[model samples]
Structure formats: C-alpha cells, structure tokens
Target: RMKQLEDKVEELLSKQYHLENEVARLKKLV
Candidate 1:
C-alpha cells in the first residue's frame, strides 16, 4: 500500500484544483 497514499494525494490535489476554479468563477459573479 505504499503507493496508495500517493494516488489519494494526487486525487485530492486535482479535486482541490477543480474546487479552486469553481470558487474563482463564483467570485467573478459577485
């Protein structure tokens, strides 16, 4: 399971990136 956390980290990071974009777009509408 050594690489398991690595995959999760990548997934979490990618998810956060998408989440960041969503927030940015929402802020632009403000």
Candidate 2:
C-alpha cells in the first residue's frame, strides 16, 4: 500500500511538472 501511494504521488508530481512547463511556454507567447 505504501508503494502504491508513493507511485501515485510521483505521478502527480510529474503531471504538475508538465503543467508548469506548459504555463511557462504560454507565458513566453505573451
């Protein structure tokens, strides 16, 4: 169960990182 939780957290972190990158790209466009 702990490992599953850790995996979920890592997945969320990666998703957040992707979102941040997208925001940065949009900022550059503006």
Candidate 3:
C-alpha cells in the first residue's frame, strides 16, 4: 500500500514537472 502511494506521487510529480516546463516554453514564445 505504501509503495503504491509512493509510485502515484512520483508519477504526479513527473507530470507536474513536464507541464511546468511546457508552460514555461509557451510563455517564452508568447
């Protein structure tokens, strides 16, 4: 159960990082 929670957290963090980078790039373009 704890391992599953950790995996979910990691996945969320990875997606957040990707989204942040994408937004930053788009902001620069705009």
Candidate 4:
C-alpha cells in the first residue's frame, strides 16, 4: 500500500512538470 501511494505521487509530479512547462511557454507568448 505504501508503495502504491509513492507511485501515484511520482506520477502526479511528472504530470505537474508537463503542465508547468506548458504554462511557461504560454507566458513567453504574452
């Protein structure tokens, strides 16, 4: 169970990284 939570957290962090990159690109356009 603990391992499962760690995996989920890592997945969320990866997704956030992609989203943050997209936000940065948009910011540069403005």
Candidate 5:
C-alpha cells in the first residue's frame, strides 16, 4: 500500500512538470 502511494505521487509530479513546461512555452510565445 505504501508503494502504491509513492507511485501515484511520482506520476502526479511528472504530470505537473510537463504542465509547467507547456506553460512556460506558451508564455514565451505570448
């Protein structure tokens, strides 16, 4: 159960990192 929670947190952090990258790209375009 603890391992599952860690995996979920890692996935969420990865997704957040990608979203931040996308936002930075858009900001540059704007």
Candidate 6:
C-alpha cells in the first residue's frame, strides 16, 4: 500500500513537471 502511494506521487510529480515544461515553452512562443 505504501509503495502504491509512492508510485502515485511520483506519477503526479512527473505529470506536473511535464505540463509545466510545455507551458513554459509555449508561453515563450506566445
């Protein structure tokens, strides 16, 4: 159960970073 929670947290962090990276890139273009 703890391992699953850790995995979910990692996935969320990874997703946030990926979205943040794209927003920054597109913001620069705009």
Compared with the true structure, all predictions reach lDDT values of 0.95, 0.99, 0.98, 0.99, 0.99, 0.98
Query: 1-30 in candidate 2: lDDT tens per residue?
Result: 999999999999999999999999999999
Residue range 1-30, candidate 6, lDDT tens digits: 999999999999999999999999999999
TM-score of 1: 0.89
Clash list (residue pairs), candidate 5: none
- Name the runs in model 2 displaced over 4 angstroms: none
Determine which window of 10 residues in candidate 1 has minimal summed lDDT: 1-10
Candidate 5, residue 11: how far the Cα is off, in Å: 0.6
Candidate 1 stretches with Cα past 4 Å from truth are none
Better of 3 and 4 by lDDT: 4
Candidate 1 structure quality by residue, lDDT tens digits, 1-30: 769988999889999999999999999999
lDDT of 5 by residue, 1-30 (tens): 999999999999999999999999999998
Model 1 root-mean-square deviation = 0.5
Ranking of models by TM-score: 5, 1, 4, 3, 2, 6
Worst 10 residues of 3 by lDDT: 21-30
lDDT of 4 by residue, 1-30 (tens): 999999999999999999999999999999
Candidate 5 stretches with Cα past 4 Å from truth are none
Question: Could you tell which candidate, 1 or 6, scores higher by TM-score?
Answer: 1
Taking all chains together, the TM-score of candidate 5 against the true structure is 0.89
RMSD per candidate (Å) reads 0.5, 0.5, 0.5, 0.5, 0.5, 0.7
lDDT of 3 by residue, 1-30 (tens): 999999999999999999999999999998
